[PDB]
Amino acid sequence: VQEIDLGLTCDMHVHVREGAMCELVTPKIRDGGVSIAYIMPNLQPPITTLDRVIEYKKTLQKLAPKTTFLMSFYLSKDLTPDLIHEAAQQHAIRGVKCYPAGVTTNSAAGVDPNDFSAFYPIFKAMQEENLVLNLHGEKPSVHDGDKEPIHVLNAEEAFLPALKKLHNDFPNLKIILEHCTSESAIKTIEDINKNVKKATDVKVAATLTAHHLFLTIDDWAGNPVNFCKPVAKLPNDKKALVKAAVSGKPYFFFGSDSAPHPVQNKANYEGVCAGVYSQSFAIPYIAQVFEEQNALENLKGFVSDFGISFYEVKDSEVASSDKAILFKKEQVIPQVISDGKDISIIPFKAGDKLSWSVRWEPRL
Amino acid sequence: VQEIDLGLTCDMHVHVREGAMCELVTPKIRDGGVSIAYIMPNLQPPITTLDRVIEYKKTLQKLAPKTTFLMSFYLSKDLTPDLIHEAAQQHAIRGVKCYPAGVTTNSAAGVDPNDFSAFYPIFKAMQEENLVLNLHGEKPSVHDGDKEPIHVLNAEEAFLPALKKLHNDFPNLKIILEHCTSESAIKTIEDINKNVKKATDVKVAATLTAHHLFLTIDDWAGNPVNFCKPVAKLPNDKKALVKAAVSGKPYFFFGSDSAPHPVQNKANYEGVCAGVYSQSFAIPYIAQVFEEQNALENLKGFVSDFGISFYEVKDSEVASSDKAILFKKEQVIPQVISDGKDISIIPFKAGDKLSWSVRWEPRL
Ligand SMILES: [Zn+2]
Ligand SMILES: [Zn+2]
Ligand SMILES: [Zn+2]
Ligand SMILES: [Zn+2]
C-alpha cells in the first residue's frame, strides 16, 4: 500500500483537559499521528501561574513520553510582564492565548477585544521574549444599537480589525489567528502576508482545524456533536478554508482544536458545550481532504513544515524523533472513544470510513 | 393599557400530536389565550384520509370543548382531487399543508418543491373549494458541488420563487407562507401585496411565530430547546419580522408553530428534534413584543382580526364565544411542563417572567 513520510507532525491547537479526561486523550495525540502538540490553557481555573504550567506539562509528559509539548498561558489581567519574562526564560511557555469573554468554553473571564490596550505590557514582554500571541478571533456578540450587530456568523469577520491593529502596534510579535472559519479571515491573512518571501518572514499566521475542512452550518444545525467555536459557516467559507489548507503557503498550518467533552455534555437541551473531538484520527482526517483535492504533495508542509518553522521547534527539544508515516489502509471511525470507566467521547465523523492510517517509524 | 379585549384570538399554526402528548397539549391552547387553532397534520402516519381527520378533530374537541378547531390534510402522494372535494363539502378540512421532504419533523413523506407539477390537480381542486394551501417554505438542502448550495440559512429564500410560481398559476387560491424567518420573505410578501389595501383582497399571507420575534441564530446555536425550522436567522431578519408583526398590515398574522417534543428528544448529541413549544403562553409572548414596540393598539389585528378575516371564520363555526382578555399580572414561565407521567416539555423562554396573563370572559 502507498505510504507518505510526514516526518515530525504538528498539531498547534490541542485541548487535553485535566483529570481522567486528560489521561484518556493525551495518549491519543501520538495515536492520531501527531508528534508535537501546542497545549491550550483554558482549564478551570485557567493557567496564569508558572507552577501550574510547569506541573501541567510534566503531567502530560508522564501520560505520553514520546510527545513534544509546547505550553501557553491564558491571557489574564493576572499576568504581569515580569511573569512573562520569567516563564519565557525558563522555557515554561511558548505563547499566550487570548479568549474574548463569553465566546467559547472557559472564556469568561477572558478579555474584551475592542480594547487589548490593557494588555500591551504583556505583549511587549512577549515580543521581547519571542513568544507567540494566539487569538480566538471572535468579537463578543452584541445585538442592540448602535453599531452593526455581532452574531456567531460574523463575529470572526468583526474581529479582523483588532487583528490588524495588533499587527500594526507590534510588528515583530508572532501572532496566530486560531482556527479560521471564514473566507474574509483567509483573505486578511493572505493580505497581511503579501510581501513575504520565504517562510521565516511570516509574523502573522492562521491555523485550520480538521473539522472546518468538512462542516458547514447544515452539519451542526440539529447536531450538537458538530457544534464548535467558531461555528462552521457557509459552503463558500468551507471552500476558501480547504483552498488555503492545500495552498502550500507558509502562513496556514494545521491546528485541530480538538476539544473533548464527555457525551453527556453534548446531549443537553440547553448550554451544549462547544467543541469537536478529532485527536484520535487527526492526520487521517486531513489526509482525506488533501487526497480529495489532489494535493497530497502539500500535506507535509501543512501538518509539519510550516508549524515547526513558525514556532521554531528545535530538534533538541523534540521528545521523540520517530516519524509519522501515512499508509493507505482503510479504517472505520469508532462510535465512541471511551476509557472504560466514566468517560465516553463521540469522535468526529463517528462511523465513517477513512482511506488512510498512521504508524510510526524510527529515523536515520 | 391594563386589560385588553383581544376578542376571538387566532393561532393559525398549531401542533398537538397524539396520545398522552395530545392530552397534555390541546387544553393549553385555551390556557394560552387562543380561541381558534389551525391544527397541522404531520402525525405518524400523516393525516391524509377523511376518517382520520374526522376522528382526530373528535378527539381534540373532547379534550377542549370550547376551542375552535380548523383541520388540514398533509400534502401527500396518496391524496386525490376527489378526496379534496369530498372532504371540503363535509367541512372536514380548511386547508392542506405542504412539507418539503426531510426539512422538518415528520416530513419524510413530503414533496419535492422543485417539481410541484404532480400536485397541480390537487391545487386546482383546493382552489374550487376555497381551501387554504399552507407551505413550510424551505427547499431541501443541496450541497452539490455544481449548482447553488442550499442550507438552513438560505433555504427559505431559495423557496421564494416556488411561492411566486404557485401564486401565478393559481391566482384565486389562498396561500400561506408559514412561519416566515427572513427579511427576503417579508419583502416578497409585501411585494405580492403591493396593491391590496384591506383585507379581503389578500390571497397570499404569511404567519409569524412567537419565537421568531425573539430568537436569532445566537439563541439556538448551543441551545437545542431553541432549535426549530425554519431556523432563526440574523438580527437583520428578526428586525424585519418584528416590524412586520406590529405593522397593522393584513397579510401578517399570528401562527405560533408551537411544536411539542419530550425533553429527551431535545437532549440528543445528534438528531435534535426541531420545534419550540409556545402554546402554554402564546398570547402573553406576543403581548411582550407589542408592548416593547409601543404598539399594543395593533395586537388585536395581529392576533385576531387578520387571521379570522383571511380564513373567513364565521360566528357559526366558533365553539365558544368567550373573549380573550389580556390582563397585566406578572407570571413566571415554568422550567418544565409535565403531565406527571412520562412527558415533560421545556417551554419557550422557560424561567423568564412575562408581564401579562390572559383570562376568558363571556359574551353577554
Ligand atoms: Zn478557540
Ligand atoms: Zn481551542
Ligand atoms: Zn413548518
Ligand atoms: Zn409547524
Residue B207, C-beta contacts closer than 8 angstroms, at least 6 positions apart: B12, B13, B176, B177, B178, B179, B180, B252, B253, B254, B255, B257
The set of cell numbers assigned to B1 is 393599557
What stretch of H or E contains A125?
helix A120-129
The set of cell numbers assigned to B25 is 397539549
DSSP single-letter state for residue A25: H
Distance CA B96, CA B75 (A): 6
Q: Which amino acid is at B297?
A: E
Instruction: Enumerate residues 68 to 127 of chain A having a beta carbon within 8 A of any beta carbon in chain B.
Output: none
Distance CA A81, CA B1 (A): 59
Residue A292, C-beta contacts closer than 8 angstroms, at least 6 positions apart: none
Whether A222 and B151 lie within 8 Å, measured CB to CB: no
Distance CA A211, CA B131 (A): 47
Residue corresponding to grid cell 493507505: A328
The set of cell numbers assigned to A123 is 505583549
Q: How far is the CA of B131 from the centre of ligand 4 (A)?
A: 18
Q: A223-226 — which CB contacts under 8 Å span 24+ positions? A: A223/B269, A223/B270, A223/B271, A223/B272, A224/A266, A224/A267, A224/A268, A224/A272, A224/B222, A224/B224, A224/B268, A224/B269, A224/B270, A224/B272, A225/A266, A225/A276, A225/A346, A225/A350, A225/B269, A225/B270, A226/A276, A226/A348, A226/B270
Whether A143 and B235 lie within 8 Å, measured CB to CB: yes
Give the number of C-alpha atoms closer than 13 A to the C-alpha of residue A21, restricted to the C-beta side: 16
Residue B13 among known ligand-binding residues? yes
Q: How far is the CA of B144 from the centre of ligand 3 (A)?
A: 24
Q: What DSSP line would sit under A267-333, residue for residue?
A: S-SSSPPP-BB-GGGHHHHHHHHHHHTT-GGGHHIIIIIHHHHHHT--GGG-S---EEEEE---EE-
Q: Is B19 on the interface with A (CB under 8 A)?
A: no
Which residue in chain A has the smallest CA separation from B144?
Answer: A235
Which positions in chain B touch A222 (Cβ < 8 Å)?
Answer: 224, 227, 270-272, 274
Distance CA A178, CA A40 (A): 11
Whether B272 and A216 lie within 8 Å, measured CB to CB: no
Residue B318, C-beta contacts closer than 8 angstroms, at least 6 positions apart: B8, B35, B36, B68
Distance CA B181, CA B136 (A): 11
Give the number of C-alpha atoms closer than 13 A to the C-alpha of residue A140, restricted to the C-beta side: 15
Q: Is A222 on the interface with B (CB under 8 A)?
A: yes
Contact indicator for B278, B34 with CB cutoff of 8 Å: no
Q: Phi/psi at B223 (nearest 5 deg)?
A: -130, 90
Distance CA B304, CA B282 (A): 13
Residue B206, C-beta contacts closer than 8 angstroms, at least 6 positions apart: B176, B177, B178, B180, B185, B186, B189, B244, B251, B252
Which residue in chain B has the smallest CA separation from A266?
Answer: B269
Residue B168 distance to chain A (closest CA, Å): 31
Distance CA B201, CA A344 (A): 59
Residue A276, C-beta contacts closer than 8 angstroms, at least 6 positions apart: A209, A211, A225, A226, A227, A228, A257, A258, A259, A348
Residue A258 distance to chain B (closest CA, Å): 17
Give the number of other CB atoms < 10 A from CB of residue B97.
24
Distance CA A9, CA A284 (A): 12
Which positions in chain B touch A266 (Cβ < 8 Å)?
Answer: 269
Q: Which of B211, B251, B215 is nearest to B234 (CA)?
A: B215
3-class DSSP state of A154: coil
Whether A151 and B346 lie within 8 Å, measured CB to CB: no
Q: Which of B214, B270, B348, B349 is best to mutate for the A interface (most A CBs within 10 A)?
A: B270
Distance CA A296, CA A6 (A): 11
The set of cell numbers assigned to B78 is 396518496
3-class DSSP state of B92: coil
Which residue in chain B has the smallest CA separation from A149?
Answer: B235
Residue corresponding to grid cell 390534510: B73
Distance CA A242, CA A245 (A): 5
Distance CA A99, CA A323 (A): 33
Q: Which amino acid is at A172?
A: N
Q: How far is CA A272 from CA A87, A260, B21, in A?
A: 35, 13, 26
The set of cell numbers assigned to A294 is 489532489
Distance CA A53, CA A48 (A): 8
Residue B15 among known ligand-binding residues? yes
Whether A227 and B222 lie within 8 Å, measured CB to CB: yes
**Experimental approach taken:** X-ray
Give the number of other CB atoms < 10 A from CB of residue B260.
25
3-class DSSP state of B12: strand
Distance CA A196, CA A211 (A): 28
Residue B85 among known ligand-binding residues? no
Burial of B263 by CB count in 10 Å (0-12 exposed, 13-18 middle, 19+ buried)? middle
DSSP single-letter state for residue B117: G
B351 alpha-carbon distance from chain centroid: 24
Residue B264 distance to chain A (closest CA, Å): 8
Q: How far is CA A139 from CA A350, B130, B273, in A?
A: 31, 52, 30
Contact indicator for A306, A298 with CB cutoff of 8 Å: no
Q: Which of A53, A64, A4, A48 is nearest to A279 (CA)?
A: A64
Which positions in chain B touch A151 (Cβ < 8 Å)?
Answer: 216-218, 234-235
Contact indicator for A13, A209 with CB cutoff of 8 Å: yes
Taking CB atoms and an 8 Å cut-off, how many pairs form between chains A and B?
A: 85
The set of cell numbers assigned to B323 is 373573549
Whether A269 and B225 lie within 8 Å, measured CB to CB: yes
Cβ density class B272-299: b for 16+ within 10 Å, e for less: bbbbbbbbbbbbbbbbbbbeebebeebb
Query: Which residues in chain B are immediately followed by a break of C to N over 2.5 Å?
Result: none
What stretches of B14-154 show up as alpha helix (H) in DSSP?
Answer: 19-31, 50-63, 81-89, 120-129
Give the number of C-alpha atoms closer than 13 A to the C-alpha of residue B281, restricted to the C-beta side: 26
Residue B136 among known ligand-binding residues? yes
Residue corresponding to grid cell 379570522: B308
Beta bridge partners of A57: none
Pair type for strands A95-98 and A132-135 = parallel
Which residue in chain B has the smallest CA separation from A262?
Answer: B269
N-to-C CA span, chain A: 22
Q: Which of B138, B152, B269 is best to mutate for the A interface (most A CBs within 10 A)?
A: B269
Q: Which of A82, A112, A117 is nearest to A98 (CA)?
A: A112
Distance CA B312, CA A315 (A): 81
Q: Which of B263, B221, B271 is nearest to A275 (CA)?
A: B221
3-class DSSP state of A254: strand
Q: How far is CA A350 from CA A5, A16, A175, A217, B196, in A?
A: 26, 20, 33, 18, 54
What stretches of A146-206 show up as alpha helix (H) in DSSP?
Answer: 155-169, 183-192
Q: Is B246 on the interface with A (CB under 8 A)?
A: no
Residue corresponding to grid cell 382526530: B56
Distance CA A304, CA A251 (A): 12
Residue B151 among known ligand-binding residues? no
Q: What residue ranges define each of the domains in chain A, with the CATH number in brackets?
A: 8-321 (3.20.20.140)
Whether A224 and B224 lie within 8 Å, measured CB to CB: yes
Q: In what order do the strands lie in the sheet with A95-98?
A: A72-74, A95-98, A132-135, A174-177, A204-208, A252-254
Give the number of other CB atoms < 10 A from CB of residue A260.
25
Q: How far is the CA of B70 from the centre of ligand 2 (A)?
A: 51
Whether B274 and A222 lie within 8 Å, measured CB to CB: yes
Distance CA B144, CA B141 (A): 9
Contact indicator for A328, A358 with CB cutoff of 8 Å: no
Q: How far is the CA of B135 from the centre of ligand 3 (A)?
A: 8
Q: Which of B299, B296, B304 is nearest to B323 (CA)?
A: B304
Q: Which of A323, A326, A335, A331 is nearest to A364 (CA)?
A: A323
Residue A269 distance to chain B (closest CA, Å): 4
Residue ranges with strand state E in chain B: 4-7, 10-14, 36-39, 68-70, 72-74, 95-98, 132-135, 174-177, 204-208, 252-254, 323-327, 331-332, 337-338, 344-345, 353-354, 357-361
The partner residue sitting opposite A270, judged by closest CB among B223, B268, B271, is B223
Residue A266 distance to chain B (closest CA, Å): 5
Residue B142, C-beta contacts closer than 8 angstroms, at least 6 positions apart: B148, B149, B150
Distance CA B340, CA B125 (A): 45
Whether A224 and B269 lie within 8 Å, measured CB to CB: yes
CA A51-A34-A20 angle, to 5 degrees, is 50
The partner residue sitting opposite A263, judged by closest CB among B151, B217, B269, is B269
Whether B267 and A271 lie within 8 Å, measured CB to CB: no
Q: Which of A81, A76, A178, A84 is nearest to A136 (CA)?
A: A178
What stretch of H or E contains A350?
none
Q: Is B147 on the interface with A (CB under 8 A)?
A: no
Which positions in chain A touch B235 (Cβ < 8 Å)?
Answer: 143, 149, 151
Distance CA B159, CA B114 (A): 9
The set of cell numbers assigned to A49 is 501561574
Q: What DSSP line would sit under B222-279, residue for residue?
A: S-GGG--SSPP--HHHHHHHHHHHTT--TTEEE---B----GGGTS-SS-PPP-B--G
Burial of A200 by CB count in 10 Å (0-12 exposed, 13-18 middle, 19+ buried)? exposed
Contact indicator for B149, A235 with CB cutoff of 8 Å: yes
The partner residue sitting opposite A221, judged by closest CB among B152, B223, B234, is B152
Q: Which amino acid is at A27?
A: P
What stretch of H or E contains A177?
strand A174-177
Q: Phi/psi at B44 (nearest 5 deg)?
A: -110, 110
Distance CA B331, CA B324 (A): 17
Q: Which amino acid is at A183?
A: E
Whether B149 and A234 lie within 8 Å, measured CB to CB: yes
The set of cell numbers assigned to B268 is 440528543
Distance CA A40, CA B111 (A): 48
Which residue in chain A has the smallest CA separation from B141?
Answer: A218
Q: Which of A178, A158, A179, A176 is nearest to A167 (CA)?
A: A176
3-class DSSP state of A27: helix
Contact indicator for B158, B141 with CB cutoff of 8 Å: no
Distance CA A96, CA A129 (A): 12
Distance CA B117, CA A62 (A): 67
Dihedral sign (CA B176, B181, B186, B187): negative
Residue corresponding to grid cell 437545542: B224
Ligand showing the shortest atom-to-Cα distance for residue B72: 4
Distance CA A128, CA A172 (A): 9
Distance CA A252, CA A256 (A): 13
Q: How far is the CA of B118 from the centre of ligand 1 (A)?
A: 49
Ion ligand 2 contact residues with beta carbon within 5 A: A 257
